[PDB]
């Protein structure tokens, strides 16, 4: 199992998905179209601002 972590703006949380496109899903980090696995995200307005 491979695990990777990063922090981004809350607007583009839904952009982390197979087949998604945009500024950050096409230039920074892209998920395979046949991706399998789970996604976990939660707010970080208290420890990163």
């Amino acid at each position: 199992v491979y695990a990777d972590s990063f922090v981004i703006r809350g607007n583009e949380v839904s952009q982390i998905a197979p087949g998604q496109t945009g500024n950050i899903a096409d230039y920074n980090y892209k998920l395979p179209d046949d991706f399998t696995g789970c996604v976990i995200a939660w707010n970080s307005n208290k420890l990163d601002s």
């Binding site: 998905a17 197979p18 087949g19 998604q20 496109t21 179209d33």
Partner: protein, 49 residues
Amino acid sequence: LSRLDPPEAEVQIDRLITGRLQSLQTYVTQQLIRAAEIRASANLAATKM
């Protein structure tokens, strides 16, 4: 394709393939019966000749 992204456009088009296969099956199904109907008359014509 010009209006929907792959993840559910793949699901949407599947209906078209299923429908077109079902429509194409009936053509050969009817042709198989018409071939036998023609063969019977061909055998009758051969016997008459």
